Amino acid sequence: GLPVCGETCVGGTCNTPGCTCSXGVCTRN
């Protein structure tokens, strides 16, 4: 499937498209 982006949401925004801020961490929606 879609793996965990594993990015931190910087300024409310994520770096990888198709990721959502869950706890400040980018995970796939």
mmCIF file with all atom_site columns, N, CA and C in Angstrom:
data_model
loop_
_atom_site.group_PDB
_atom_site.id
_atom_site.type_symbol
_atom_site.label_atom_id
_atom_site.label_alt_id
_atom_site.label_comp_id
_atom_site.label_asym_id
_atom_site.label_entity_id
_atom_site.label_seq_id
_atom_site.pdbx_PDB_ins_code
_atom_site.Cartn_x
_atom_site.Cartn_y
_atom_site.Cartn_z
_atom_site.occupancy
_atom_site.B_iso_or_equiv
_atom_site.pdbx_formal_charge
_atom_site.auth_seq_id
_atom_site.auth_comp_id
_atom_site.auth_asym_id
_atom_site.auth_atom_id
_atom_site.pdbx_PDB_model_num
ATOM 1  N N  . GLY A 1 1  ? 0.831  -1.202 0.000  1.00 0.00 ? 1  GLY A N  1
ATOM 2  C CA . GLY A 1 1  ? 0.000  0.000  0.000  1.00 0.00 ? 1  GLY A CA 1
ATOM 3  C C  . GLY A 1 1  ? 0.851  1.231  0.000  1.00 0.00 ? 1  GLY A C  1
ATOM 4  N N  . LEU A 1 2  ? 0.357  2.284  0.599  1.00 0.00 ? 2  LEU A N  1
ATOM 5  C CA . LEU A 1 2  ? 1.106  3.505  0.711  1.00 0.00 ? 2  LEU A CA 1
ATOM 6  C C  . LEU A 1 2  ? 1.841  3.525  2.046  1.00 0.00 ? 2  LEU A C  1
ATOM 7  N N  . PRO A 1 3  ? 3.176  3.565  2.013  1.00 0.00 ? 3  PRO A N  1
ATOM 8  C CA . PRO A 1 3  ? 3.994  3.545  3.217  1.00 0.00 ? 3  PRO A CA 1
ATOM 9  C C  . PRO A 1 3  ? 3.938  4.871  3.968  1.00 0.00 ? 3  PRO A C  1
ATOM 10 N N  . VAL A 1 4  ? 4.279  4.822  5.236  1.00 0.00 ? 4  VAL A N  1
ATOM 11 C CA . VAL A 1 4  ? 4.296  5.995  6.079  1.00 0.00 ? 4  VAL A CA 1
ATOM 12 C C  . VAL A 1 4  ? 5.343  6.972  5.552  1.00 0.00 ? 4  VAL A C  1
ATOM 13 N N  . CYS A 1 5  ? 4.908  8.190  5.280  1.00 0.00 ? 5  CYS A N  1
ATOM 14 C CA . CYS A 1 5  ? 5.765  9.245  4.747  1.00 0.00 ? 5  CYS A CA 1
ATOM 15 C C  . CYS A 1 5  ? 6.912  9.509  5.725  1.00 0.00 ? 5  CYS A C  1
ATOM 16 N N  . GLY A 1 6  ? 6.577  9.548  7.017  1.00 0.00 ? 6  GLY A N  1
ATOM 17 C CA . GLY A 1 6  ? 7.580  9.690  8.053  1.00 0.00 ? 6  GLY A CA 1
ATOM 18 C C  . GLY A 1 6  ? 8.240  11.028 8.047  1.00 0.00 ? 6  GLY A C  1
ATOM 19 N N  . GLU A 1 7  ? 7.503  12.025 7.695  1.00 0.00 ? 7  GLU A N  1
ATOM 20 C CA . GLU A 1 7  ? 8.019  13.361 7.693  1.00 0.00 ? 7  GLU A CA 1
ATOM 21 C C  . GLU A 1 7  ? 7.357  14.113 8.805  1.00 0.00 ? 7  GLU A C  1
ATOM 22 N N  . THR A 1 8  ? 7.928  15.192 9.195  1.00 0.00 ? 8  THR A N  1
ATOM 23 C CA . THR A 1 8  ? 7.338  16.028 10.170 1.00 0.00 ? 8  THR A CA 1
ATOM 24 C C  . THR A 1 8  ? 6.677  17.201 9.473  1.00 0.00 ? 8  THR A C  1
ATOM 25 N N  . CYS A 1 9  ? 5.492  17.531 9.896  1.00 0.00 ? 9  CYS A N  1
ATOM 26 C CA . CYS A 1 9  ? 4.763  18.624 9.321  1.00 0.00 ? 9  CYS A CA 1
ATOM 27 C C  . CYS A 1 9  ? 5.358  19.935 9.737  1.00 0.00 ? 9  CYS A C  1
ATOM 28 N N  . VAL A 1 10 ? 5.978  20.567 8.805  1.00 0.00 ? 10 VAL A N  1
ATOM 29 C CA . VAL A 1 10 ? 6.631  21.806 9.025  1.00 0.00 ? 10 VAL A CA 1
ATOM 30 C C  . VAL A 1 10 ? 5.691  22.958 8.689  1.00 0.00 ? 10 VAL A C  1
ATOM 31 N N  . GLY A 1 11 ? 5.348  23.731 9.695  1.00 0.00 ? 11 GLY A N  1
ATOM 32 C CA . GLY A 1 11 ? 4.474  24.879 9.513  1.00 0.00 ? 11 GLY A CA 1
ATOM 33 C C  . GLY A 1 11 ? 3.060  24.482 9.136  1.00 0.00 ? 11 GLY A C  1
ATOM 34 N N  . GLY A 1 12 ? 2.634  23.323 9.598  1.00 0.00 ? 12 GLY A N  1
ATOM 35 C CA . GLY A 1 12 ? 1.294  22.835 9.307  1.00 0.00 ? 12 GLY A CA 1
ATOM 36 C C  . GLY A 1 12 ? 1.208  22.094 7.984  1.00 0.00 ? 12 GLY A C  1
ATOM 37 N N  . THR A 1 13 ? 2.281  22.120 7.235  1.00 0.00 ? 13 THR A N  1
ATOM 38 C CA . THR A 1 13 ? 2.305  21.495 5.941  1.00 0.00 ? 13 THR A CA 1
ATOM 39 C C  . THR A 1 13 ? 3.268  20.330 5.890  1.00 0.00 ? 13 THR A C  1
ATOM 40 N N  . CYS A 1 14 ? 2.938  19.369 5.095  1.00 0.00 ? 14 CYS A N  1
ATOM 41 C CA . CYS A 1 14 ? 3.756  18.213 4.909  1.00 0.00 ? 14 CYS A CA 1
ATOM 42 C C  . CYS A 1 14 ? 4.576  18.402 3.632  1.00 0.00 ? 14 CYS A C  1
ATOM 43 N N  . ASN A 1 15 ? 5.602  17.602 3.449  1.00 0.00 ? 15 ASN A N  1
ATOM 44 C CA . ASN A 1 15 ? 6.456  17.727 2.287  1.00 0.00 ? 15 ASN A CA 1
ATOM 45 C C  . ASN A 1 15 ? 6.025  16.778 1.170  1.00 0.00 ? 15 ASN A C  1
ATOM 46 N N  . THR A 1 16 ? 5.655  15.570 1.529  1.00 0.00 ? 16 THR A N  1
ATOM 47 C CA . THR A 1 16 ? 5.193  14.611 0.564  1.00 0.00 ? 16 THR A CA 1
ATOM 48 C C  . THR A 1 16 ? 3.700  14.771 0.262  1.00 0.00 ? 16 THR A C  1
ATOM 49 N N  . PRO A 1 17 ? 3.368  14.886 -1.029 1.00 0.00 ? 17 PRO A N  1
ATOM 50 C CA . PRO A 1 17 ? 1.992  14.960 -1.490 1.00 0.00 ? 17 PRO A CA 1
ATOM 51 C C  . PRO A 1 17 ? 1.245  13.645 -1.222 1.00 0.00 ? 17 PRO A C  1
ATOM 52 N N  . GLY A 1 18 ? 0.101  13.754 -0.608 1.00 0.00 ? 18 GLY A N  1
ATOM 53 C CA . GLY A 1 18 ? -0.688 12.592 -0.303 1.00 0.00 ? 18 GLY A CA 1
ATOM 54 C C  . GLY A 1 18 ? -0.418 12.102 1.088  1.00 0.00 ? 18 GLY A C  1
ATOM 55 N N  . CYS A 1 19 ? -0.017 13.006 1.937  1.00 0.00 ? 19 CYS A N  1
ATOM 56 C CA . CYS A 1 19 ? 0.256  12.701 3.311  1.00 0.00 ? 19 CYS A CA 1
ATOM 57 C C  . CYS A 1 19 ? -0.516 13.658 4.180  1.00 0.00 ? 19 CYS A C  1
ATOM 58 N N  . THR A 1 20 ? -0.801 13.257 5.377  1.00 0.00 ? 20 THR A N  1
ATOM 59 C CA . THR A 1 20 ? -1.550 14.068 6.290  1.00 0.00 ? 20 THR A CA 1
ATOM 60 C C  . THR A 1 20 ? -0.848 14.144 7.613  1.00 0.00 ? 20 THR A C  1
ATOM 61 N N  . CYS A 1 21 ? -1.080 15.206 8.307  1.00 0.00 ? 21 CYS A N  1
ATOM 62 C CA . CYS A 1 21 ? -0.471 15.449 9.573  1.00 0.00 ? 21 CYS A CA 1
ATOM 63 C C  . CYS A 1 21 ? -1.228 14.765 10.679 1.00 0.00 ? 21 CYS A C  1
ATOM 64 N N  . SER A 1 22 ? -0.685 13.683 11.136 1.00 0.00 ? 22 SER A N  1
ATOM 65 C CA . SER A 1 22 ? -1.229 12.957 12.230 1.00 0.00 ? 22 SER A CA 1
ATOM 66 C C  . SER A 1 22 ? -0.233 13.027 13.390 1.00 0.00 ? 22 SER A C  1
ATOM 67 N N  . UNK A 1 23 ? -0.496 13.887 14.385 1.00 0.00 ? 23 UNK A N  1
ATOM 68 C CA . UNK A 1 23 ? 0.400  14.065 15.536 1.00 0.00 ? 23 UNK A CA 1
ATOM 69 C C  . UNK A 1 23 ? 1.657  14.867 15.154 1.00 0.00 ? 23 UNK A C  1
ATOM 70 N N  . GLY A 1 24 ? 1.628  15.443 13.966 1.00 0.00 ? 24 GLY A N  1
ATOM 71 C CA . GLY A 1 24 ? 2.733  16.232 13.482 1.00 0.00 ? 24 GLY A CA 1
ATOM 72 C C  . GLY A 1 24 ? 3.588  15.431 12.554 1.00 0.00 ? 24 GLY A C  1
ATOM 73 N N  . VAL A 1 25 ? 3.211  14.193 12.380 1.00 0.00 ? 25 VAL A N  1
ATOM 74 C CA . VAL A 1 25 ? 3.916  13.284 11.528 1.00 0.00 ? 25 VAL A CA 1
ATOM 75 C C  . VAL A 1 25 ? 3.077  13.010 10.293 1.00 0.00 ? 25 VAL A C  1
ATOM 76 N N  . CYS A 1 26 ? 3.712  13.028 9.162  1.00 0.00 ? 26 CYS A N  1
ATOM 77 C CA . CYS A 1 26 ? 3.080  12.758 7.896  1.00 0.00 ? 26 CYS A CA 1
ATOM 78 C C  . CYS A 1 26 ? 2.828  11.273 7.703  1.00 0.00 ? 26 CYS A C  1
ATOM 79 N N  . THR A 1 27 ? 1.583  10.913 7.649  1.00 0.00 ? 27 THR A N  1
ATOM 80 C CA . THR A 1 27 ? 1.192  9.563  7.381  1.00 0.00 ? 27 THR A CA 1
ATOM 81 C C  . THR A 1 27 ? 0.232  9.600  6.200  1.00 0.00 ? 27 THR A C  1
ATOM 82 N N  . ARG A 1 28 ? 0.001  8.480  5.576  1.00 0.00 ? 28 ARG A N  1
ATOM 83 C CA . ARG A 1 28 ? -0.859 8.431  4.415  1.00 0.00 ? 28 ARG A CA 1
ATOM 84 C C  . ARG A 1 28 ? -2.298 8.487  4.823  1.00 0.00 ? 28 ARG A C  1
ATOM 85 N N  . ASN A 1 29 ? -3.041 9.275  4.113  1.00 0.00 ? 29 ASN A N  1
ATOM 86 C CA . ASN A 1 29 ? -4.444 9.459  4.390  1.00 0.00 ? 29 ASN A CA 1
ATOM 87 C C  . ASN A 1 29 ? -5.264 8.312  3.863  1.00 0.00 ? 29 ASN A C  1
#
